[PDB]
Amino acid sequence: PLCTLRQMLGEARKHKYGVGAFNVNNMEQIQGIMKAVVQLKSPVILQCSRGALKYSDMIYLKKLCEAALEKHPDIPICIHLDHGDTLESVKMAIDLGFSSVMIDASHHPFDENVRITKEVVAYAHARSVSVEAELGLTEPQDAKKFVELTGVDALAVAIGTSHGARLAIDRVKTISDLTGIPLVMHGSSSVPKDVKDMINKYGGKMPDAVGVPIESIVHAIGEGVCKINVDSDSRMAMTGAIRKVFVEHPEKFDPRDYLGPGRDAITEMLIPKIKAFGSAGHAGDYKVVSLEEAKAWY
Amino acid sequence: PLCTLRQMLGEARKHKYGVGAFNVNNMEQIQGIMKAVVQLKSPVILQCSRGALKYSDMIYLKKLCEAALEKHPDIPICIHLDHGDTLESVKMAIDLGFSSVMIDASHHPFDENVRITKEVVAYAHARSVSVEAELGQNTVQLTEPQDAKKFVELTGVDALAVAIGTSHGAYKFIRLAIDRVKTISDLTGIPLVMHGSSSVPKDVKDMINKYGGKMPDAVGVPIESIVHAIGEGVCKINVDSDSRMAMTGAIRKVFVEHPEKFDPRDYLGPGRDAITEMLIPKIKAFGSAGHAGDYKVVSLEEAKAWY
Ligand SMILES: [Zn+2]
Ligand SMILES: [Zn+2]
């Protein structure tokens, strides 16, 4: 069922695990992801950037998310906005039935950031929708101050991690104890040796591709990281899969012949990382509080 | 809004133009088609095969079709089951909200086809859903006009696919039996449907062979042949292979031209655009452009009343 980020990450925080928030943009990405989480009876966060929503003209990504929800009742599924920039951005994503939004005013100075955010926190919680915000690396004491002022449900920390294709697990615990709320790890794609290889092997050019070792990410989960943002890994697994169909079967032209293998490569790539993140088997742990009931939380 | 096949084709016969039914399997293809028909303000038929529904686990395609309906409120959109095999198939289709279904029992002996067809026609009509059936590929042996008139009379199907020299796939073959098209159209008095109507454009086909592909010998139906047939009573043009090809070509192209590109949107986006570009010339030659705004679409509930 549609689950808020507060309850999902709250449960992950309690039993010391992370979930894994996967970015989606079309039908096959969602199917690939859902196939891995239902095989591992894992809760899941399906996340859409403003960019994804653009590419999907909004309504199509909105409907594919509903498809998922109905197809996999019983699986706790949170639909999350990812790098929202304005209040209008999250208001739009909340109108598409999202259960969580990220207001990224990180690039702003503290008090304007606190302000942008407080504004999204008011509109969101007034509807049960959870909020994630970012700060900065991250100064623990500012983390504590920020959360206390904004009231966000989850905090994206800067522990020396980035986008595309070690860290400060030292500051994570401090930030987790000082803040007392689930922390989010963006840029956590790993760039598996398998995904990068197949790609370069079938005509691609991504030589200098490296990411966050899974291990680093697990140590972070111990210190209080509850959400693991993954995006680049799904992409490369899709691309390498079709590059391969193209060279081993240049006569094939039906998109299902390559897009299908692509969808499968995401599942296979995600299966080990969900396992290691710790959420395998927890889908059935709790009854999902609706956005309406969730309003009472605030 | 959701439109029936009967109404949509009914309207194209009266003005002698053809609609053009495009097979869809996922998000990008449906966007590609919609971007063309809205730009041309044309009615459109979105077709989903049993394989397409299996590939989309049914619901995702259901949901993608609802987005299209809701995003483009004023474009008459017919949601159509292509090549259904069993009554259970059209039952499953109709329950996904389809407004039209083809029961293809054409490989069966007349009486058996008629039997198959009849049982589906009852189910659908008792709910407003249009029905298309087939009686009858390439250098054909063709379909007999007197038979067509007897099949229709006996089944009451809303449209009928006929064999006039056409065949599925990207390896079709030079001309069609337009002579048969005219007398079948007149005899039956109902909209005819043309299967295996992809043209395999020079444009789409070169791209593929230029960028790693291997579809050497590959031919389609000339678009002029379709305009002729359309003029003699064909109101539905099924196109599938062309979209597949358009998308495979543009993806093969970003791959070669930017081997460092790994985000699916960088090749699926163009693939979707190449599909829009390929359909525009096709649609205006079909004579459908600018007709989206003619009639007022009759719902299924109200369509029940025609039967
Ligand atoms: Zn991020
Ligand atoms: Zn066909």
Swiss-Prot record, chain A:
Cofactor: Zn(2+)
GO MF entry, a single one: zinc ion binding
Protein residues bound to beta-D-fructose 1,6-bisphosphate: S49, H163, G164, G187, S189, N229, D231, S232, R235, R256
Catalytic activity: beta-D-fructose 1,6-bisphosphate = D-glyceraldehyde 3-phosphate + dihydroxyacetone phosphate
Result of altering D254A: 159-fold reduction in substrate affinity and 2770-fold reduction in catalytic efficiency. 6-fold reduction in substrate affinity and 24-fold reduction in catalytic efficiency
GO biological process terms held by the UniProt record: fructose 1,6-bisphosphate metabolic process; glycolytic process
Effect of R235A: 1.8-fold reduction in substrate affinity and 2.8-fold reduction in catalytic efficiency. 6-fold reduction in substrate affinity and 24-fold reduction in catalytic efficiency
Enzyme Commission number(s): 4.1.2.13
Residues holding Zn(2+): H83, H163, H186
Biological or metabolic pathway of the protein: Carbohydrate degradation; glycolysis; D-glyceraldehyde 3-phosphate and glycerone phosphate from D-glucose: step 4/4
Protein name per its UniProtKB record: Fructose-bisphosphate aldolase
Organism: Giardia intestinalis (strain ATCC 50803 / WB clone C6) (Giardia lamblia)
Phylogenetic lineage: Eukaryota, Metamonada, Diplomonadida, Hexamitidae, Giardiinae
